[PDB]
Amino acid sequence: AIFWNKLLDRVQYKENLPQAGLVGDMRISYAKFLELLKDQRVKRLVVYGDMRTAVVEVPHPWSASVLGHPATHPFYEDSAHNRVSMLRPNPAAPEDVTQWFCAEMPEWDMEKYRFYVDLPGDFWESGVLQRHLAAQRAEGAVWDPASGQYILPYRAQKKVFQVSTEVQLLDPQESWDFLGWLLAPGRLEFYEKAACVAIALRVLGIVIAIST
């Protein structure tokens, strides 16, 4: 499997275009994509082979955090079967719940819209993706000697509904379009039929020849 699974992903590359969260006219505008990106709502970004098309994956608002909102599947439960929550009260700004801190759900347990976006011709030299990356990766744990501790500062934690973006690029050489066209199902069934008939005729030649 370890080997074959890879091989098969290259021959049948067309069956892997996202057909799950993308339903109709699923486009978003470039301004809306930028606005979602700058507020850390996008979970995964998948740039494509030609660098001019992306499939933005945004989680359903209630599946973004680990709030116990009863519109999601009960993945994680207490002993008394209640959904767990992880909210924390944000000491600097109470009285507003949308500014509290909360851990984010593991990515395999998320519902996701999969929007399609066309990127302009100067997407790379404008530096938007670079600014976003460089800002969001420039925070981590620090040492405070005033308390002699290891601190994860507040400005490096996720508020409610925010997630951590994962950027991924695809390789055009992982497509293997020729074999995907040659071993298409219709051609496969034709090859099967022709092989069957050829075996039949050969064995019939053998039968009528040896009985002579």
Ligand X SMILES: CCCCCCCCCCCCCCCC(=O)OC[C@H](CO[C@@H]1O[C@H](CS(=O)(=O)O)[C@@H](O)[C@H](O)[C@H]1O)OC(=O)CCCCCCCCCCCCCCC
Task: Show contacts with another protein in window 168-207 (CB under 8 A).
Answer: 168-170, 172, 175, 177-178, 181-182, 184-192, 194-199, 201-202, 204-205
Region of residue 187 (phi > 0: left; psi between -120 and 50: alpha; otherwise: beta): alpha
Q: 5 vs 147, which CB is nearer to another protein? A: 5
**Would the CA dihedral through 32, 35, 40, 46 be positive or negative?**
positive
Burial class from Cβ neighbours inside 10 Å (0-12, 13-18, 19+) for residue 189 reads exposed
Q: Which residues are 115's β-sheet partners?
A: 56
Please state the closest distance from residue 131 (CB atom) to another protein, in A.
Answer: 10
Among 4-12, 67-75, 78-86, 172-180, which window interacts with ligand X (CB under 6 A)? 172-180
SS3 151: strand
Nearest distance, CB of residue 28 and another protein, angstroms: 6
**Does residue 192 bind ligand X (CB under 6 A)?**
no
Q: Which is nearer to ligand X, 77 or 177 (CB)?
A: 177
Tell whether residue 10 is a contact of another protein (CB under 8 A).
no
Q: Report how far residue 45's alpha carbon sits from residue 56's, in angstroms, rounded to the nearest whole number.
A: 5
The residue ranges that bind ligand X (CB under 6 A) are 175-179
